[PDB]
Amino acid sequence: LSTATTLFWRPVPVHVKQQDREDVLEELTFRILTGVAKQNHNLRILRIHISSDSDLFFLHTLEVSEEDFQSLKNDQDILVDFASFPGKIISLLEKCILAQPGDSPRFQAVLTIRGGESVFKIVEINDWKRLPHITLAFRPGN
Amino acid sequence: DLSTATTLFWRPVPVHVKQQDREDVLEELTFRILTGVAKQNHNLRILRIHISSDSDLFFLHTLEVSEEDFQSLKNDQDILVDFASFPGKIISLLEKCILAQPGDSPRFQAVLTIRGGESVFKIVEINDWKRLPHITLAFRPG
């Protein structure tokens, strides 16, 4: 990625679930970056890295180009453009950081790893249920 | 039929209705929400939701859930309240669907997808950046 810009780089509380192992609350580092493709300076690219300061082998990545963003828009019913998308994810992440055990509403981050694929989702716990705000597919490694 | 049934809600609601591979049309459907007990067991509470139409008397879709089967729905839809509190939440959402106006933000929207033997009802919230599903319910022929 050329001339990449860091939009977000902070620890976030995440409920991490392995395929058949324990469901554990951990502090994962989120790094969100924007830049352009090395092969095309007109093609903008979003990257999100999920890592861990305690486990150096822990790494999950999402990458989406502007020209492939419509697929994500269709899948997740997103109504804003590519440029506005990272700010929304950031807003959700900030809410997860602020969340307390007794809160309502309460935002919660969840990462489910089933092998070769991990599913990241942020949910809101309102007065009567858990409301899914976003569901994103991440891949193992870089 | 339900013994000592009480009607909690009986109102027309704007619904985007999609027939099997056919047209997606906005129609006014009547929703009736009632609670009562099983004819065979006065201790078993039962919720029923009827979807009808004042213009088409042949139209009827039904959902029924007993208190002892409510846990399945709680798990499926991530519901955090008890059986008794559940209808009031659905009613509130339906009223928001009734009130929604062009230009409103947020704006609530009701959707019914009809297949051969089953229909899927959903209420979504359209905020600034996406469509947020608040509830998804399966209906059966009356």
Q: How far apart are the first and last CA of chain A?
A: 13
Contact assignment for B78 to A128 by CB distance below 8 Å: no
A29 touches chain B (CB under 8 A): no
Of B79, B131, B133, the CB nearest to A128: B79
**Pairing mode, strands B119-126 and A106-113:** unpaired
Contact assignment for B130 to A77 by CB distance below 8 Å: yes
The string of DSSP letters for B83-122 reads TTTHHHHHHHHHHHHHH--TT-SSEEEEEEEE-SS-EEEE
User: What distance in Å separates the CA atoms of residue A120 and residue A129, rounded to the nearest whole number?
Assistant: 19
Q: Where are the alpha helices (DSSP H) in A20-134?
A: 69-76, 85-98
Q: How far apart are the first and last CA of chain B?
A: 12
- Give the containing element (helix H, strand E) for A31: strand A23-37
Q: Three-state DSSP class for B39?
A: coil
Q: Three-state DSSP class for A76?
A: helix
Contact assignment for A128 to B77 by CB distance below 8 Å: no
C-alpha to C-alpha distances, B114 to B22, B28, B36, B42, nearest whole angstrom: 10, 15, 27, 33
- Give the containing element (helix H, strand E) for A123: strand A118-125
Mutate to test the interface with A, among B16, B76, B130, B136 (most CBs of A within 10 A): B130
**B30 Cα distance to chain centroid:** 10
Structural biology method used: X-ray
- Cα-Cα-Cα-Cα dihedral of A21, A23, A27, A32, to 10°? 80
> Residue A57 has what DSSP assignment?
T
User: What distance in Å separates the CA atoms of residue A93 and residue A90, rounded to the nearest whole number?
Assistant: 5
CB atoms within 10 A of CB A107: 21
Of A88, A123, A132, the CB nearest to B129: A88
Give resolution in angstroms.
1.9
Of B78, B126, B129, the CB nearest to A130: B78
Q: In A, residues 43-102, which contact B (CB 8 Å cutoff)?
A: 76-80, 84, 88
**Pairing mode, strands B107-114 and B3-18:** parallel
